[PDB]
Ligand SMILES: [Cu+2]
Ligand SMILES: [Cu+2]
Ligand code: NA
């Protein structure tokens with residue numbers, strides 16, 4: 001299995017912490033360098049937490065599970081046409097394959113794959129996910145993938161992690177960000193199989209991740225040629 | 230496939246209509262006759278609605294889908310030991326098989342099977358489910374399976390279907406009723422397969438259903454030897 005040693009978090013003067021109705025905590029940063037734009041969430045995922053199946057059109061994504069435990073779901077089919085939803089009423093629901101993550105495992109998921117994750121354990125677990133802006137849709141406004149704007153719609157800001165705020169979108173807002181997001185687990189899903197296709201297993205893009213880590217570390221060193229916010 | 234012509238609803242002077250956070254509407258009645266105790270819900274299930282996977286210990290259940298459409302999930306494994314939850318932390322999650330229901334299809338699910346259902350379509354659909362009290366646990370207080378008491382905990386009463394009430398348990402209350410109820414879809418689930426095992430397909434108990442329909446119809450005729458409430 002593929003592992004990665006560390007994905008650091010950009011340290012912002014005022015972090016963006018988002019709390020969701022699923023009681024997840026997202027610590028989010030957006031960064032840019034001359035050649036690259038991305039966003040990163042360092043997340044705490046309670047039992048049952050995690051995103052329902054969804055498909056990205058404007059970013060490629062990495063998931064990194066420092067303690068394993070998190071179960072990810074991933075298709076072998078790609079869904080290159082955002083206008084064709086994988087639902088009963090239209091194109092058809094898809095088949096997903098589960099991944100039981102291991103400590104420091106790195107899961108790369110390119111655009112157009114259907115994926116999600118859940119914490120199926122009885123204890124809260126960490127996960128990091130990284131969105132790198134791809135080459136699609138020059139008119140899309142968010143050069144980092146829009147992670148900060150997207151998540152601001154799905155729950156309140158945490159001004160105190162010691163005193164969490166009350167709760168009141170995850171699905172309905174999504175297409176504005178080039179995401180087809182399901183609102184219930186079985187909306188886009190025909191089957192779930194625990195037999196992992198080798199082709200999913202092999203997906204990797206360490207090169208771009210290493211570049212984003214360089215940017216993050218440069219930012220944290222005070223380097224003014226990159227920015228995170 | 231197995232069908233049934235009609236399962237009538239007992240007409241109560243004051244119906245118990247329950248509204249849930251999933252926006253489902255349950256019209257519930259409890260009945261008894263000398264030989265039998267049961268409860269019945271005539272339900273309206275919006276898109277994405279339906280119960281997450283669960284297992285019963287004190288009732289046997291029937292599902293009847295007048296218009297089809299509803300997708301049901303069902304195990305081949307039975308889970309006879311209520312103390313052993315089918316979770317990551319303990320016994321292990323289970324395999325479920327999907328059923329794409331047809332108009333008037335009758336699905337019989339004995340105690341100890343894991344099951345659930347969802348509306349995967351874009352339109353609200355009807356479903357009827359019937360709980361018949363089994364022979365287990367003489368000290369269990371609810372001679373009809375406790376459907377009315379159980380559902381009263383999961384959402385408010387509808388005093389006007391034209392003006393639905395605001396919303397605020399489905400999982401946490403369940404064991405009091407001999408139900409192990411999952412709070413998220415993948416909590417008890419390892420796989421979902423769309424290849425239906427013949428053994429599930431063959432489950433039936435028309436005899437007991439016919440008896441409950443007799444009771445319901447007798448009640449609706451004014452017959453005082455049976456009661457519904
Ligand atoms: Cu994603
Ligand atoms: Cu049930
Ligand atoms: Na690409």
Ligand code: NA
Nearest residue numbers: 289339340363
């Ligand atoms: Na039995």
